[PDB]
Amino acid sequence: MISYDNYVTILDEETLKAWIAKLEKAPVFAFDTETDSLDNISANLVGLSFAIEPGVAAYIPVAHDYLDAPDQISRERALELLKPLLEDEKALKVGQNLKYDRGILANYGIELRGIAFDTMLESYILNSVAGRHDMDSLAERWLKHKTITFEEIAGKGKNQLTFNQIALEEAGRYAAEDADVTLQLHLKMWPDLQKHKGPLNVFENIEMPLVPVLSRIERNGVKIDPKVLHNHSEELTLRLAELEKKAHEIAGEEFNLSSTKQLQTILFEKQGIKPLKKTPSTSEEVLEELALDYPLPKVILEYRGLAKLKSTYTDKLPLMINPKTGRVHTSYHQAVTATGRLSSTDPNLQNIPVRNEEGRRIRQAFIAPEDYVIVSADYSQIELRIMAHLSRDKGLLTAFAEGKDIHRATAAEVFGLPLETVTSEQRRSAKAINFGLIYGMSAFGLARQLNIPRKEAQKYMDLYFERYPGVLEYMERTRAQAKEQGYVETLDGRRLYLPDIKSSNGARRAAAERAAINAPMQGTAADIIKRAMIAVDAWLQAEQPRVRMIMQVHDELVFEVHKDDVDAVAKQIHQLMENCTRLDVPLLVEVGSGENWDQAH
Template identity: 65%
Template structure:
């Protein structure tokens, strides 16, 4: 696409508002952005951002935004099926249209809507009017149809990709000039707008016809020449065109953008934007666009945007290349109350990362980068890594010299490779942000800088490149590397100042950071570096067995289907299940095809053999590719262990997550899944000990709800599932059957996750009315639980969040949503989050306490994994019995509840045996 031709400095800009609207909505749908009142704001944010970007790029240009009018247009009169297949506008988009209109007007832009025509026609008419006056026009759109308007005065700009398309760009993208775009659309048709086109003519055929002969008129004047063209189907194409001439000509009319609409506004009426700042601030506050509010409030004080605000801080970044300069900075660090610290390395994998340099900052805008291992051709002489670390060690290992960093666990792991123990961690900006609002989408430095400071930082890709050609940090020239690295330290310090100012206003949240998250950093660092010993041979054997079983399942599936097919192809599976085997369709995809999703197959598997075989095959395939094949490849060649990475700032509830590998997702409900844990083995002379909280969320429910029945059952050490079964099914405790206990277990756990009667019926395979009766009996037995659920829902709606026992907060932006499904989902979260979050807090507190105890005790024990409510250790055989009793006590004391915290511990030669 040609980007060589630049529009004049101040072209007329016509924004296709309707195109913006839909593209913005679908681009933001995955993030599902909403304000605290539950109002969707994704499309509003994206459209506003694109408009702001245009205005900033063309500050002197007159700009107008054009939207489609409601109701039918002349095209509907030409063809009643025009756009008939388009689904109705989604509710979440419809609710954002009016706010977008308000923001457009507040930005000082004319909002143009003309009855009876589409936005394209208004834009086309204005563009031609401007061209006639010799005025250049930029049309901001993502609509391919607009390419027909491009000429020497008209250029398209795609604001989402920031690309321009002129006449050469049209030729490059479509293979034809702008004047043939209408003919192109007429031949191909358009499924989105339901333009019929010529049956059997796709993009390649249309191009062959247009490039070989010319437009529609030329084609119909030269039907006899079409057979001479060299494309598939050319011999029969003349007949197709002749038979469908009426459709082709109708399609031509439908695809043609009108350029002669009688408009209420003319080009002369469109002026350079004059925004209404007060109104914009009001709207941005309503939709909680904090960065833009800061920009505008700064502008009211004489500052134009966030970049100007950033320039107010004098930026001085030093590159330290000799010991004299290093000593000057070490003096600054040693006298600073707090300094920001960051490492630059060769890899994101902490077990492989080599230190390339360090950066630090002591005040906003003043930072330094000390390179030690840049080795590109022409790199200047640098302080040696050994000398730098020797001089830095006293500061880095000092508890009294306080540090702040962004994701300091990584830096701690890197320094540990050089036998330096990072101490004195006062703050971590990633965790401060996470504790302040765990439901915010990301907590990386670039995102936080934009969110809290209104600053765009230097991105790593900007200095290192992308993909296979991306440079490692040691290969990047200091002219680029130093500002990037120094900025990291500077921005980290500024972020701490901004975020902590908010965090300190919430004593409960500040305590979560200080007492739970911060002390956990060194504990997780140690666990990661300890790693887990894995038997690769055992996994290899299991991989072979899984492959054999998958082959067998595939053959069985072929027998049932009566033919061979690709088990992994949804399309082929749809055909086999629903067309050839005539299995009833119980759910469809958004596009209307029969669904073969997991939950659909699970339901069908209750009655039909093929879905059951497919599910088992899928399960084994995932097990093989994710674990038995992959885990051996992840074994570190030096330590012979697997070293996962734990993430503190990912889940909304406070739970830890892990990657490379994901230990939390190793299946435990199937025999094949449990066999994977056999491969996590104890080293010689040791045993694996797995210590697990028993029914912790139910115990937390008892504490939070203060239901006397639950409190009594747990205090007496009763089997809670049997106790519940006895009450719900009205039988004596010793008469409870295995099936009744299983049902009670489903009720106990299901209700704390907000399960409905429908969900319980599905899980237990019973009638919905029976499930509803079970739930009714449950709440009669434990009325405090019902009371708690009602109270927490009301509290969540009133304040917009819920809290754990220790003050961790989970915001629920959809708790007041008008959409019932979204609101009910938020209500279910409101019920469960305090329990799941409190369980997360307890296991984190336990990890900190156990780590501290191990450091002070005589035990030679390694904590090697944390998975859900479980801690896993390697323990010397001679210390096992004593250790088990002691660790159970310490884990049980991690929280004081009104019911006992029960910890169960198992011992084995591998992780599975320890259960």
């Protein structure tokens, strides 16, 4: 176990000051905060823990208020004595998910500096796919130590206690162990993170500096109009009713809009071909093939889609508005994706349909406050530009260089015809090839996206590789080093380990080869986006203009800018994004604005 003998519980100023003195001369120190809620903006700090050396850690309770809780240093007195140390950029701190801790302190007017090491990110940069990067998983992987779980001291279910309700000593065991373990994890991982300059570079200049900027974006939140979302909800109810009637009217009787049950009994029973369509799906959608002529499958297609969107965003979004700020605070995850891109939840901004009309209405609900406007800064087809650079292809490089539409430029080369005459179908064919290459799509998978026969798709890809030889080379070379060293890297050095590259399993090894071609372009896009965020945030902090960075979704950064400042600010965001990141890839940033996210998008 871990008893009350392990760590000290600081209940007096004199002892706290003794520790602050030791903390001041430590080379690095682990630090952690305890609160009464996972919600950063409204959580209250219940206590703090520190670790100066493996096995030497302490817990300082400041707001435990259960019946008869012992005297504790007051939250205000503890923070004023600790403030200088916390705000000192020279005092280096180590922590697990420091983004959270930085925010809690910000609730009390404290600016946490010296945010040097985050064990979550150390683990993530070492090997993004090694497993989960949370402390409990980390302590077990690297230290063969099983940590005290929050459930162990607080309980489970609705009757679960909040930190302020837990006994001082019990809270101490948990909090001081976090600090201690975090320091031990750093001592084991930091030395390893130096065996390679690639990962070390990404960790030091991309991931760590991004920690406080993610905190600031999350805490800023985004303005959502609940009325608009409600109208959209009422209207969708009516549209779902109408659509259901249109389905019944086309055939007979009533039925659910569920395939492999009520649909096959209608659809193919009235002429068609037996198999159904899985909601596997992004490759063989039987329902949308029939949709080009057959009416029923087209209405069932649209019905399901609207049903999904209503319960996911229309009904959910209004419930996420924080009472304290009046805004929605999404959760960004910095150590979850395999390629290094940021993910998002509650809400998952990336699942809002882009090329769909309803998704546009969801976006219209993201509004700018009075006298402000929503500004969108996007990296135009960054992955494609990255592939152009990685393949060193003069053809692609020149297309982007002279500002031509790469999809029409590619079609003009593949099909051999003037750029002005390329048709929509030809452009659509080249476009499917271009994005297919990024995901390492098979010549048959391209046929399923283009609806053309196999070997006809193969005919296009051979014509493509002949016109753009540099792309085949990159593809072959990347699969090469992937087998030679078990991993692939981005331009900045970020690595994706591929354990199934020599799998001996067929499909399992195919996946690893696709990931081999894909990761370098996706990871590089990710690195670029993170560098722009740090650069834009740095300008924001230094110059203090009337602008907030509110979102990050796909390849765009969304802001709130004062209406009278839009022009100067747009010039600035634009320069920072395509000139203060990587100077090797030919980058283009498209900046737009409006009353809501949809207008600026």
